[PDB]
mmCIF file of C-alpha atoms and ligand atoms in Angstrom:
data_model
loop_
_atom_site.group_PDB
_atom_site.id
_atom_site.type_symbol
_atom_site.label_atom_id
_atom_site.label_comp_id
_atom_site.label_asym_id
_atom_site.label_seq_id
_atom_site.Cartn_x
_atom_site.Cartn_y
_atom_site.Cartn_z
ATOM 1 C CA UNK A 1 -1.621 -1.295 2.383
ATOM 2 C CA UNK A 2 0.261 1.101 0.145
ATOM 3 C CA UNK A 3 1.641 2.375 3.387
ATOM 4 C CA UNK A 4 2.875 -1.062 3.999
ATOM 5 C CA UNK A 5 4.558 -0.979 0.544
ATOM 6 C CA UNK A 6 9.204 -0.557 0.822
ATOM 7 C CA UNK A 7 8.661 1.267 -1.997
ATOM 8 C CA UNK A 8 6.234 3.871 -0.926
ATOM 9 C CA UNK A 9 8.494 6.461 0.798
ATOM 10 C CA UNK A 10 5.114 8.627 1.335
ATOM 11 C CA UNK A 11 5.393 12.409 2.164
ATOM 12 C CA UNK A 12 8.816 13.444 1.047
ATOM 13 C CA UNK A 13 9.635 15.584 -1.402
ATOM 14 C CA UNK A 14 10.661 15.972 -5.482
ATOM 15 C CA UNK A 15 14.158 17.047 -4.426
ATOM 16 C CA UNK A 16 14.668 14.620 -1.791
ATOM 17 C CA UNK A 17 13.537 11.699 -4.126
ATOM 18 C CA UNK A 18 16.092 12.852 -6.277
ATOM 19 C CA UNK A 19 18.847 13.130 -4.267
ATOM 20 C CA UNK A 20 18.433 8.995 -3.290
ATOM 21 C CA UNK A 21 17.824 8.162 -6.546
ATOM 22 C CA UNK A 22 21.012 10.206 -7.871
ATOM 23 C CA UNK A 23 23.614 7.590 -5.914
ATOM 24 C CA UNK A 24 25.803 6.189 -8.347
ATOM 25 C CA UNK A 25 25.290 3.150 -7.473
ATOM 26 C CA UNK A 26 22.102 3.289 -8.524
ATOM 27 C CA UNK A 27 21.028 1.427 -11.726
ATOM 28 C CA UNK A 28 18.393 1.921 -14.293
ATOM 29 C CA UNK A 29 14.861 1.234 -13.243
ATOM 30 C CA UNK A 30 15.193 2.608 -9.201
ATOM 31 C CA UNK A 31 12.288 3.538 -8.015
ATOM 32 C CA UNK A 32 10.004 5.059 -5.458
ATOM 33 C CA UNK A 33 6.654 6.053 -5.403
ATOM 34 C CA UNK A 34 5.735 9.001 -2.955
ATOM 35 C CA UNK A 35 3.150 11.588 -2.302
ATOM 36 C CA UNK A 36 2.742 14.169 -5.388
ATOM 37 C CA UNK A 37 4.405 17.586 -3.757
ATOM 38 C CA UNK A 38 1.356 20.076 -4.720
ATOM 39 C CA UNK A 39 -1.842 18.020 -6.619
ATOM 40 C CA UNK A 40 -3.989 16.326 -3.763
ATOM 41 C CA UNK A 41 -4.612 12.262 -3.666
ATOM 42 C CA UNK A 42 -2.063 11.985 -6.607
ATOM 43 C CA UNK A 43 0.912 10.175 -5.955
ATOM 44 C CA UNK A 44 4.609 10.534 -7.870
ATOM 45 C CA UNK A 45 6.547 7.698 -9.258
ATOM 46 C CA UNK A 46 10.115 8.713 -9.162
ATOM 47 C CA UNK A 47 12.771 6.666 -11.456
ATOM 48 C CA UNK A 48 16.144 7.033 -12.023
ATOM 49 C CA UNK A 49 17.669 6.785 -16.378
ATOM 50 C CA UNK A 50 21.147 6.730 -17.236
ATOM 51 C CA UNK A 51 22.258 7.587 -20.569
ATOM 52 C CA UNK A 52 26.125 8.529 -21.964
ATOM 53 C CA UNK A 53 23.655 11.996 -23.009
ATOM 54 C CA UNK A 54 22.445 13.246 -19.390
ATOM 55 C CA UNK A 55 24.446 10.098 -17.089
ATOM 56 C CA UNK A 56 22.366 9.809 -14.102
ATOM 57 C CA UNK A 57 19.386 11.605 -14.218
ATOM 58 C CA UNK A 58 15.840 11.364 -12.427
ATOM 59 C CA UNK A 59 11.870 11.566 -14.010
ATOM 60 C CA UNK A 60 9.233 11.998 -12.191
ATOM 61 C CA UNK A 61 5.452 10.567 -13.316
ATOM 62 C CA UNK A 62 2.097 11.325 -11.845
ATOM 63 C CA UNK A 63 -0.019 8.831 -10.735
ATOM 64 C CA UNK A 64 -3.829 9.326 -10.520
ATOM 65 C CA UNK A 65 -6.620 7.240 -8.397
ATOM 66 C CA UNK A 66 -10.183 8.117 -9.379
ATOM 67 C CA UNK A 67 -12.874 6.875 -6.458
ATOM 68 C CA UNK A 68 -14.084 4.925 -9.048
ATOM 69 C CA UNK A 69 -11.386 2.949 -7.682
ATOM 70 C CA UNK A 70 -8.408 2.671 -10.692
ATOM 71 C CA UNK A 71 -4.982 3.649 -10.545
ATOM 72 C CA UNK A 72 -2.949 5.025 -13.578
ATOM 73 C CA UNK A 73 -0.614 7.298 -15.063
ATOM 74 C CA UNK A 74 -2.194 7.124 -19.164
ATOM 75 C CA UNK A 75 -5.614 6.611 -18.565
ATOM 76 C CA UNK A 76 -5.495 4.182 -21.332
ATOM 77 C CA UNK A 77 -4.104 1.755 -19.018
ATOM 78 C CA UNK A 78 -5.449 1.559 -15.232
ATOM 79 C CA UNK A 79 -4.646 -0.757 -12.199
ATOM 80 C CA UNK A 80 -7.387 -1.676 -9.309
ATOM 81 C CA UNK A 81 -4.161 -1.088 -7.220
ATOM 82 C CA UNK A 82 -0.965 0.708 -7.248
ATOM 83 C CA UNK A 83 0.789 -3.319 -6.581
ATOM 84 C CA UNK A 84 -0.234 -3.715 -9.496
ATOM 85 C CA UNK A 85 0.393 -0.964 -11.456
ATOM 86 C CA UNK A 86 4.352 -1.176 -9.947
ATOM 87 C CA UNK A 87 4.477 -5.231 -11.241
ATOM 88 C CA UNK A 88 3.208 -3.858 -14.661
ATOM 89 C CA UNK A 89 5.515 -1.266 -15.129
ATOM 90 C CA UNK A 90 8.486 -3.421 -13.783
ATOM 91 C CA UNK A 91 7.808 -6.012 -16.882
ATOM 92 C CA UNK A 92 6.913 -2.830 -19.410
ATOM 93 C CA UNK A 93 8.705 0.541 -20.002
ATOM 94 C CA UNK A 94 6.053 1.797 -22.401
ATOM 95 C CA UNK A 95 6.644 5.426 -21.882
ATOM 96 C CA UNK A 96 8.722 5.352 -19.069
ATOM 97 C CA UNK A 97 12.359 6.270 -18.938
ATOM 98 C CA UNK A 98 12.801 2.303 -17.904
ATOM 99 C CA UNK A 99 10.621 -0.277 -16.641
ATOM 100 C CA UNK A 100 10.873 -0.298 -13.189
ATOM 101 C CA UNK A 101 13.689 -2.308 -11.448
ATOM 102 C CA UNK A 102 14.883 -2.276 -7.761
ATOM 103 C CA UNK A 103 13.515 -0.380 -4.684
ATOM 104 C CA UNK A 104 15.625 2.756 -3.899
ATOM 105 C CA UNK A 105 17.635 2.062 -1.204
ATOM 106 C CA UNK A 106 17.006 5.206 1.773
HETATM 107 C C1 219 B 201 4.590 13.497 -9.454
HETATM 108 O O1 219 B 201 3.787 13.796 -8.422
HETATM 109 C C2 219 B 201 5.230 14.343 -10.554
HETATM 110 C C3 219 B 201 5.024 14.008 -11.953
HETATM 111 C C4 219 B 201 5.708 14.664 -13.041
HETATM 112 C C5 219 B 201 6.618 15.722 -12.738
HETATM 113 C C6 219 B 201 6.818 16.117 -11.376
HETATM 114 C C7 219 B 201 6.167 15.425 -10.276
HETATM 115 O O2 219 B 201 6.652 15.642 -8.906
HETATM 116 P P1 219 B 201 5.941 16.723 -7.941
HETATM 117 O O3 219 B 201 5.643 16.283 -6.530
HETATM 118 O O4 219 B 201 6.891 17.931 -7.946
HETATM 119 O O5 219 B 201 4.820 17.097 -8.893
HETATM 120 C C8 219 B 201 3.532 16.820 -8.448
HETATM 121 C C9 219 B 201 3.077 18.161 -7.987
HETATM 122 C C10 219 B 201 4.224 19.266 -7.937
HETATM 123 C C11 219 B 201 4.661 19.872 -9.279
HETATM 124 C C12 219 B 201 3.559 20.164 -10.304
HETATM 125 C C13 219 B 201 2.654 18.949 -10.422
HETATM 126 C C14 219 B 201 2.055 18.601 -9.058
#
């Protein structure tokens, strides 16, 4: 299911999310979500900012799945799936760099 997801790009790692989401032609808002490098059944939400400050530049924001079943990255505000939690944070930045835009292309 999340496996099925284009914008799950699974086992790869912090630097190699960053080096696809540092192509110019990316804009705000890119995206992936992938396996967290080192802190078992957590996942990483990678998104690429822009700003005349930094330019391109890449954050990175843990995502957390309790067996009670939610998904979130504030615990304030959980998912019952990480669909879901993507469509939220692609209406809301909240504390995000942006709100989440298009799929990073490979
Ligand atoms: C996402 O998993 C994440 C959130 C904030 C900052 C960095 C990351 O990417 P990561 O795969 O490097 O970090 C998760 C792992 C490795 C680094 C320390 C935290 C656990």
């Amino acid at each position: 299911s999340i496996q099925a997801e284009e914008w799950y790009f699974g086992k790869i790692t912090r630097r190699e999310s960053e080096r696809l989401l540092l192509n110019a032609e990316n804009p705000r808002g890119t995206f992936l979500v992938r396996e967290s490098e080192t802190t078992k059944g957590a996942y990483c939400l990678s998104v690429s900012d822009f700003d005349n400050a930094k330019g391109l530049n890449v954050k990175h924001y843990k995502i957390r799945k309790l067996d009670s079943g939610g998904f979130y990255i504030t615990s304030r505000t959980q998912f019952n799936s990480l669909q879901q939690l993507v469509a939220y944070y692609s209406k809301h930045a909240d504390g995000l760099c942006h709100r989440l835009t298009t799929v990073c292309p490979t």
